[PDB]
Amino acid sequence: MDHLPIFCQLRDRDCLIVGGGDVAERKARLLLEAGARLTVNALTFIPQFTVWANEGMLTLVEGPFDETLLDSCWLAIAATDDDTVNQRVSDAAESRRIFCNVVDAPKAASFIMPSIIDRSPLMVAVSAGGTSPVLARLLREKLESLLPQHLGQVARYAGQLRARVKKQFATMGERRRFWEKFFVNDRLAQSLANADEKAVNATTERLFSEPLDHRGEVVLVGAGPGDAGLLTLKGLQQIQQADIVVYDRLVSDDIMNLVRRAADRVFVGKRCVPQEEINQILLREAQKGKRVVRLKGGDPFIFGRGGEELETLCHAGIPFSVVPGITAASGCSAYSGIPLTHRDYAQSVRLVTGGGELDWENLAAEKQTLVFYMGLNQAATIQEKLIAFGMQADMPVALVENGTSVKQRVVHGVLTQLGELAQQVESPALIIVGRVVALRDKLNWFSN
Amino acid sequence: MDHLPIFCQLRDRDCLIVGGGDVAERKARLLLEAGARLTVNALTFIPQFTVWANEGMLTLVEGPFDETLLDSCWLAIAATDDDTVNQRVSDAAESRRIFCNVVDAPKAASFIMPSIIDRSPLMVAVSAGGTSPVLARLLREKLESLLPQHLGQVARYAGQLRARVKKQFATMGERRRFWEKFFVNDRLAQSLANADEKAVNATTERLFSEPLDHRGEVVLVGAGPGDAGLLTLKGLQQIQQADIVVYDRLVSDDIMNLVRRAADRVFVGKVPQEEINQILLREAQKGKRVVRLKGGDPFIFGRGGEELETLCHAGIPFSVVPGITAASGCSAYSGIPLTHRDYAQSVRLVTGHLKGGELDWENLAAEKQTLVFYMGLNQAATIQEKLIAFGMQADMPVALVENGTSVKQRVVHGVLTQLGELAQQVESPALIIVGRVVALRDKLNWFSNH
Ligand SMILES: Nc1ncnc2c1ncn2[C@@H]1O[C@H](CSCC[C@H](N)C(=O)O)[C@@H](O)[C@H]1O
Ligand SMILES: Nc1ncnc2c1ncn2[C@@H]1O[C@H](CSCC[C@H](N)C(=O)O)[C@@H](O)[C@H]1O
Numbered sequence: 001m002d003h004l005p006i007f008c009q010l011r012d013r014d015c016l017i018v019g020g021g022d023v024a025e026r027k028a029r030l031l032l033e034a035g036a037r038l039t040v041n042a043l044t045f046i047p048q049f050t051v052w053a054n055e056g057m058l059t060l061v062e063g064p065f066d067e068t069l070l071d072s073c074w075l076a077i078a079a080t081d082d083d084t085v086n087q088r089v090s091d092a093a094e095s096r097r098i099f100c101n102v103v104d105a106p107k108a109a110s111f112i113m114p115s116i117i118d119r120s121p122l123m124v125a126v127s128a129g130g131t132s133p134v135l136a137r138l139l140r141e142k143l144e145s146l147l148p149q150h151l152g153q154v155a156r157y158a159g160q161l162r163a164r165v166k167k168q169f170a171t172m173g174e175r176r177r178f179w180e181k182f183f184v185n186d187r188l189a190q191s192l193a194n195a196d197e198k199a200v201n202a203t204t205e206r207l208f209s210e211p212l213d214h215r216g217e218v219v220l221v222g223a224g225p226g227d228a229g230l231l232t233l234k235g236l237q238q239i240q241q242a243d244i245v246v247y248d249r250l251v252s253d254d255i256m257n258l259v260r261r262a263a264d265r266v267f268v269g270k271r272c273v274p275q276e277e278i279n280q281i282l283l284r285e286a287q288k289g290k291r292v293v294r295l296k297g298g299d300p301f302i303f304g305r306g307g308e309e310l311e312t313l314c315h316a317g318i319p320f321s322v323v324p325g326i327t328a329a330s331g332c333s334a335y336s337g338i339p340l341t342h343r344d345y346a347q348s349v350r351l352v353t354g355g356g357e358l359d360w361e362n363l364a365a366e367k368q369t370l371v372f373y374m375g376l377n378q379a380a381t382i383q384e385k386l387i388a389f390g391m392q393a394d395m396p397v398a399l400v401e402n403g404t405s406v407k408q409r410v411v412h413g414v415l416t417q418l419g420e421l422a423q424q425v426e427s428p429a430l431i432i433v434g435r436v437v438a439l440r441d442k443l444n445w446f447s448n
Numbered sequence: 449m450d451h452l453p454i455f456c457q458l459r460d461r462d463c464l465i466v467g468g469g470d471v472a473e474r475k476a477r478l479l480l481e482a483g484a485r486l487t488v489n490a491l492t493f494i495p496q497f498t499v500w501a502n503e504g505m506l507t508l509v510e511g512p513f514d515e516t517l518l519d520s521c522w523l524a525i526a527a528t529d530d531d532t533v534n535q536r537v538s539d540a541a542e543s544r545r546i547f548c549n550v551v552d553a554p555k556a557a558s559f560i561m562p563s564i565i566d567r568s569p570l571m572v573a574v575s576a577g578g579t580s581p582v583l584a585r586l587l588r589e590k591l592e593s594l595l596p597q598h599l600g601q602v603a604r605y606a607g608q609l610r611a612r613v614k615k616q617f618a619t620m621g622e623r624r625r626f627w628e629k630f631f632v633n634d635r636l637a638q639s640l641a642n643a644d645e646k647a648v649n650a651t652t653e654r655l656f657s658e659p660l661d662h663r664g665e666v667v668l669v670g671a672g673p674g675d676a677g678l679l680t681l682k683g684l685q686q687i688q689q690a691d692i693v694v695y696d697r698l699v700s701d702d703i704m705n706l707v708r709r710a711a712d713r714v715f716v717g718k719v720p721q722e723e724i725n726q727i728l729l730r731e732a733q734k735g736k737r738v739v740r741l742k743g744g745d746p747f748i749f750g751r752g753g754e755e756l757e758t759l760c761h762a763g764i765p766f767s768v769v770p771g772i773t774a775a776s777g778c779s780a781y782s783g784i785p786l787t788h789r790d791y792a793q794s795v796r797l798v799t800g801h802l803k804g805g806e807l808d809w810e811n812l813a814a815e816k817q818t819l820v821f822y823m824g825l826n827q828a829a830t831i832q833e834k835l836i837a838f839g840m841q842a843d844m845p846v847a848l849v850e851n852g853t854s855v856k857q858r859v860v861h862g863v864l865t866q867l868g869e870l871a872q873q874v875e876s877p878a879l880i881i882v883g884r885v886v887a888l889r890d891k892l893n894w895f896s897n898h
């Protein structure tokens with residue numbers, strides 16, 4: 001153990017920063033966030049410091065380092081470019097037994113500032129003693145994605161329920177299992193963050209009244225179009241807490257590798273499976289008291305039949321929520337260099353599927369970006385109908401297969417080639433029609 | 449934040465523990481492992497303090513509390529079962545500006561001792577400030593299974609290489625690129641764990657020999673519509689690594705809280721477009737990792753294309769991270785699915801703000817679609833008038849979602865003949881949704897009613 005981590009209470013304690021540039025501004029913001037009573041001593045200050053000074057959030061002392069500014073200080077930070085000044089600061093702090101950090105020389109003085117993940121009152125700190133700040137960042141990154149943004153409010157509320165938990169749950173083991181489902185309960189975290197004090201109370205007594213091993217809910221999670229980096233933080237957090245994950249073929253294998261190892265997996269994709277068995281599967285797993293994640297390709301509410309699955313759950317009294325995902329159109333647009341809107345090119349974007357028939361007159365109108373989902377089989381018809389209803393023959397068209405994935409393929413041309421272009425791709429694929437398609441020559445940054 | 453975590457260097461620094469029982473023993477063990485010069489002042493001591501005193505590892509002072517023992521100290525710990533004594537210690541420490549922990553009273557005095565995961569020199573500390581020891585324990589145990597034990601040897605080797613990296617690589621960008629490759633080479637980690645110095649040396653020499661991509665870059669990142677949990681994993685990695693983040697009014701404060709503290713932030717709010725272009729260009733040509741952070745999705749009414757065209761003209765590399773557009777976010781969080789079993793064949797994302805141009809109202813009035821108007825609040829009265837005049841039924845359900853996905857989300861709803869009036873009950877940023885799917889809110893709304 002090279003350093004001892006301690007969590008300091010800085011509120012209304014005098015602290016000194018020496019320096020007044022960008023580096024000192026970052027440290028000053030951190031200490032202000034911690035509630036420090038801050039003096040900043042520098043030869044010159046960048047504008048952010050004078051702003052804070054007139055707002056009375058700190059004190060500025062312009063001029064050379066004055067060691068007597070340390071006389072009632074609890075922490076000192078030397079944040080200048082000048083090794084000689086930093087050494088004067090760290091020597092003066094050391095003689096007064098004030099913990100001191102030199103930003104550009106972590107091993108020079110008496111404390112190191114770690115990477116911080118703030119979920120107050122819950123806090124996580126990572127440091128490798130100045131050996132490995134890039135590693136500390138890589139870990140901080142990971143932890144940021146894993147810790148829900150509102151976990152702190154849950155932690156405060158947990159403190160208030162401690163006495164109730166121990167009187168209800170006689171044993172440490174039973175308590176532990178309660179806390180485990182308490183700290184992952186989604187409606188609790190969201191009710192707390194929304195100040196929905198009635199929803200807090202309803203979730204709170206469902207947690208005390210339901211059987212200890214029951215934690216039944218359903219979360220519809222949008223997996224995005226393929227690239228595992230396009231999952232949301234919340235979607236990752238939910239699949240890390242699932243007892244059961246129900247997924248189909250349009251959820252990428254890369255996404256499924258992020259699923260909690262101990263979660264049961266139920267594949268409902270087509271290896272011809274109707275929708276009602278899926279609705280039933282979700283119903284029964286949740287009634288078992290399990291935490292069910294329904295993982296869907298893209299966004300659950302865009303041609304995903306997500307509403308159909310939730311209506312099944314609504315009458316049965318099963319709590320549910322929805323985590324939106326990147327729909328295929330947004331993902332393919334970004335990864336093929338084809339923005340769905342651009343300047344004057346398109347006043348609107350239409351997301352359309354390939355009883356009833358498409359309004360071909362409507363689809364042919366100018367100033368649109370058309371995006372066809374599940375439309376490959378209708379591709380030759382789309383070419384002839386658009387041409388037959390007045391869309392200009394030179395209108396650019398593109399097809400994007402397996403968008404955002406490492407096997408993405410993008411074919412392109414003009415509308416008179418559309419039916420022939422669709423031959424060269426297979427599902428899952430998008431058809432994009434409109435002037436924005438021509439922008440791919442400049443904006444394609446991904447590799448085909 | 450409730451506390452500021454700091455990692456203190458205690459070697460040869462005087463510390464004091466008051467108390468001589470099991471609690472004091474556990475804190476003493478930590479301070480001794482950190483190299484502190486430790487005095488323990490207590491009326492009685494459990495036997496482990498004798499063993500340590502006999503080995504010369506600390507000093508015992510048997511007796512009541514001696515305030516003067518704090519005189520040379522950097523830290524103090526009150527670890528008695530006597531709350532009156534503990535408060536005398538914390539008062540004496542306070543007067544001397546000595547950080548002090550009262551073990552049985554986390555909210556009193558001036559520092560808390562966190563739970564520690566040791567991968568020395570790598571260390572992770574976790575605490576809930578006494579509010580929930582169970583949460584800290586559960587987190588501590590999960591982080592423990594997440595951090596491989598090889599990490600300590602990797603970090604130790606990195607520390608040994610730091611002098612060489614500084615001498616061989618002139619710029620900050622080059623050194624960062626070296627470290628990013630160093631810390632994810634699994635073979636190097638295994639070779640360190642096996643004490644295989646030939647393999648360590650071979651991989652190391654190859655790593656120092658690789659060229660580094662000296663170029664700055666611009667990443668367009670979609671922040672999503674507000675809820676910080678809706679940022680993508682890749683988007684988070686971009687803003688946790690960026691040198692500069694250029695952001696707008698429509699990027700929520702909670703998203704900005706995920707931008708790493710070391711990045712410079714540049715607010716381009718109220719700034720015309722080609723002035724933003726100029727900022728991105730200037731910073732990227734200086735070799736920085738630039739993120740342009742935009743509300744929602746960058747390629748849906750974001751002007752994301754114009755920015756990228758300027759960079760392509762200048763030879764600057766760029767990429768795009770899509771985000772959750774306002775339509776998808778407000779859909780999920782208001783309980784209004786954008787499509788549903790032949791309620792809606794089609795979704796139309798439309799701007800309500802054009803460059804003498806006018807929308808194709810015949811087209812927008814078509815049946816069996818969901819209309820979503822972006823920046824249409826000021827035009828809501830005209831939208832109602834035109835949709836009615838081109839045949840949309842007067843009772844078509846409509847909803848307006850203000851600050852969708854945030855804790856301040858407000859939803860108002862009604863029928864098309866109320867759209868102009870409903871719009872005066874909300875302010876920007878708001879989305880207008882028109883379509884039969886709006887009626888599904890009563891059965892699918894899970895978020896709140898504000
Ligand atoms: N990675 C991908 N690349 C191109 N198209 C995709 C795709 N993933 C899904 N799609 C499209 O979506 C259709 C299935 S409908 C499901 C759509 C999904 N809810 C979403 O939001 O994207 C496929 O036929 C295909 O047209
Ligand atoms: N959180 C939010 N709630 C409601 N509407 C929002 C919103 N965030 C953005 N918008 C809408 O988006 C408009 C700006 S245009 C920018 C849209 C963004 N690129 C996206 O993909 O969503 C605003 O006028 C408002 O209509």
Ligand SMILES: [Cl-]
Pocket residue numbers: 127128129130131132133134136
């Ligand atoms: Cl480090």
Ligand SMILES: [Cl-]
Pocket residue numbers: 575576577578579580581582584
């Ligand atoms: Cl705690």
